[PDB]
């Protein structure tokens, strides 16, 4: 329903869920919003229950140093921005120093609109640029995007942005496990593939997507599984489709799952791996075990150490004759 | 006899017959690319006792244990490594043992072993006794040890000697027939024979009689007529850094392999391929090269436009390279004492034209080893006119001693990123030293990554007062005194329970997990009389919380000159 | 197809066989010639799809 929110000074900074309750129910905003939420628990669900009713903004949006916040999905009903109140330089959307920012709302379901203010993306080292351009497109005003609005650096430059798609060539659902066999993705330097990182989690509603929830650390939402590299052989066609068997899944239950390549960064992370789509599959009706994600980093510098040796060996051993 | 200048066994066993007589290898030794097993034992050479440059084995087949081939090899003086190692055994298909029971010393370089099929008996070695600087080794890509058992004489009464390393005390043994018999403690560093008869001081590896100078198998410094003297006498000249040889011999050798000039040339009591920078063989003589009359910089060309430096041999290629006229890239992943060798190889670099990139140079905590680097011409830059690029480098606590170091870029703007143990203070100091501050942007030199975990100079904010409660604290700290109060001065109070005073500052990495610096932002109150305060509620009637504050200028424009104000970490226990 | 690591050497072996590989003989003491008249070979087989032609250039009859 139409429930405007008349505020003092037209700019309410919200750095705490206690400030979220102040606008619980404030669908239409009389002013702008500023966010500096760096740490806290129950951010996703509380922000959904409080600010989920947000139908539109009259002013602008500023998001500075919002670390613990991973995604913006908590602004579900947000569709339009009047851009009446705007940050210096006509900025409806302003973002800065958002480390754990992984993804924006959606660019296939959620439609957006912008009236007057421009965009801004800097120091978002975990947010890729594809989503940025998708916003530029859907939100409209794509001509308002000027230079320096989105520096390609510090914008998802750290978090690997998968460029290619992967395919499940063969699948089998059981009541307690699930067998998977996907395309043998192999970059030019086959040895650059340290393995695969399957992600999976129960999901009865298909409305789930990536980065729906994450604290300062992301050891809470998804269920990860490492898979050693495949077995390469001569006649590249001869290598069997790499696969894996996921274990321990409730009978007659929908799980959302997707692959994620574990690859190595080149001089400029040129080896952008691949990933498949969020696949929903219903099961059949019938001492700190989790590993440290930090280990991944340790597996990188060592791998690049071996390949830097072989490439050197062959660089001086063999000789081409006249 | 003495072979040389190098041997490369390739595709045939009969080539092994070049090892019958000569016992010294005055150069590298490669053995590789053979496919046969029948004649695995039809060859073996009791004469080999010493190697000088290094040893390399690759894709060799038929061989089961190296020891059966070199029953007398003792020393490897590592005059020249392969990548960073003096001994490499890669992708061997049948090597069941490393042998070399008599191997008693290695001078330079580390070892690298991996991808071997059925090789164990690598941990049983006391590398510390046979190899100094064992940390630079790489011995992980080999067969698991639990599978073979790695036993040795002592299966029935321990026969093999015993030592302790890395908190593990056990036997030291290569083979099931022989052991790694170390020297006694009476002489320690000195050499020794079997039955613990310590050899001459300047001996190395082993010998045939205690205190004997000529019955020695190897020499610590230099050979001469077999007499293991620790110093090359006059009228002679050092060669391959391991043998003091005659003068005329330095002329009979050939150098057309690399440069077909008038053989080698003598300088500093050594027969150098060509004496170092600043010297010429006036009159084209193999015995004298006076100092050049001009600058005489030894230019250093580029096979590939950029000479990626990620090894020690890559630096050896640049030993005398004083003016590297090619683009440069550092990619060192590991290495501990390499920094010292680079002061002998790269320490003479005075100019590096082209871009200079540093990507994942974790092994370098300070670039001071380029003691002579003063001008990066940067005539040829990367994308963005970057004449000095630094990306995803680890700690690098420092670059130089700007108090005395003179560095100046001629063209191109620098770039720095992801240097947690380097706070931008030093980066801005470098800029001031170079006057390039008017050339950089605000996104290139980011303060959000450079210095994440770097705790360095900062202004203080003295806690004006605190009043604790059973579960809360009302704490007021002093207002910041910047040069411009117009700046968006905004404090952030950091806090967390401190049961023990061994607490440190926040470093970004402690976002999630226990003992995380909890942060709360607050703007300076408009009233210029009231000072910033906060009431905190996550407290205990008896807990000792460590808390402080951090203030930043936050100039109008993004990072004009950010000078941070850091307050002491105060421990507070409520009543 | 591009070749790297152990597969490059496996193909080079399949090519040479009993013919053997060709190296640069060290004719004199000191350093050797320019380690290669061009960049490394992987710059032709890893980064580019090197055909049998390039593979035969390093072999020995
Ligand atoms: C194997 O034998 C070598 C014989 O030298 C042992 O020594 C390491 O050799 C280097 C250079 O030959 C020594 O460095 C020299 O030391 C002086 C004085 O300390 C210093 O100014 C230079 O660094 C110079 O290069 C080094 O001292 C020497 N190591 C020791 C412990 O003395 C090597 O230790 C032997 N290997 C084993 C495992 O014992
Ligand atoms: C290590 O022990 C041996 C013991 O055999 C010492 O041998 C002595 O070595 C010198 C020359 O190296 C020999 O001089 C020689 O003189 C004889 C005539 O006496 C001559 O026929 C030989 O051709 C040679 O010119 C000396 O005979 C020899 N003595 C013995 C008993 O073998 C050796 O000196 C010791 N190494 C040292 C001290 O560094
Ligand atoms: C190793 O040394 C032995 C002798 O010291 C060499 O055998 C000599 O080679 C010549 C070749 O012209 C033969 O005529 C002689 O008969 C050989 N000696 C004997 C005792 O038969 C042998 O060739 C040397 N090996 C190498 C690789 O040089
Ligand atoms: C908010 O309401 C006031 C009326 O009290 C109006 O003057 C102002 O323009 C409104 N601002 C926005 C952003 O709607
Ligand atoms: C938008 O740009 C115009 C043109 O200079 C300026 O007058 C106006 O103040 C700007 N608005 C904001 C919010 O920066
Ligand atoms: C999915 O729908 C449920 C039910 O309305 C809602 O609670 C949840 O937040 C939605 N999540 C997503 C990612 O759409
Ligand atoms: C600096 O960059 C500009 C544009 O990126 C380009 O002209 C060139 O790379 C540099 N300018 C010079 C060399 O004058
Ligand atoms: C060189 O360094 C010294 C000491 O830091 C300094 O006094 C001098 O001005 C510097 N000169 C140049 C040209 O950088
Ligand atoms: C202080 O040292 C003790 C061990 O004596 C350790 O248990 C504790 O975690 C340390 N505290 C900090 C803050 O490092
Ligand atoms: C505060 O704590 C100190 C610590 O002993 C105590 O002496 C004092 O009486 C306390 N005062 C109040 C008001 O709690």
Author numbering:
A (entry chain B): 308 to 593, 683 to 718
B (entry chain A): 1 to 156, 159 to 577
C (entry chain D): 3 to 63
Paper text:
Within these hybrids, one αβ monomer derives from IR and the other from IGF-1R (Soos and Siddle, 1989; Moxham et al., 1989; Soos et al., 1990; Bailyes et al., 1997).
The retained 3D class was then further split into “head” and “leg” regions to allow focused refinement of each map volume, achieving an average respective resolution of 3.70 and 3.73 Å for the two regions. Only a single IGF-I moiety was detected within the structure, despite their 4:1 mole ratio in the cryo-EM sample. The interaction between IGF-I and IR domain FnIII-1 is sparse, though potential salt bridges occur between IR domain FnIII-1 residue Arg539 and IGF-I residues Glu3 and Glu9. IR Arg539 is not conserved in IGF-1R, nor are IGF-I Glu3 or Glu9 conserved in human insulin, implying that these putative receptor-to-ligand salt bridges are unique to the IGF-I-to-IR interaction. However, the engagement of the IR αCT segment with IGF-I and with domain L1 of the IGF-1R monomer mimics that of the IGF-1R αCT segment within [IGF-I]-bound homodimeric IGF-1R. In particular, the IR αCT segment engages IGF-I via strictly conserved residues His710 (≡ IGF-1R His697) and Phe714 (≡ IGF-1R Phe701) but engages the IGF-1R domain L1 via less-strictly conserved residues Phe701 (≡ IGF-1R Tyr688), Phe705 (≡ IGF-1R Phe692), Tyr708 (≡ IGF-1R Phe695), Leu709 (≡ IGF-1R Leu696), Val712 (≡ IGF-1R Ser699), and Val713 (≡ IGF-1R Ile700). The IGF-1R αCT segment is located on the surface of the ligand-free IR domain L1 in the canonical ligand-free disposition of the αCT segment (i.e., with its axis directed at about 45° to the direction of the L1 domain β strands; Xu et al., 2018). Overlay of the respective receptor head regions reveals only limited relative domain displacement and rotation.
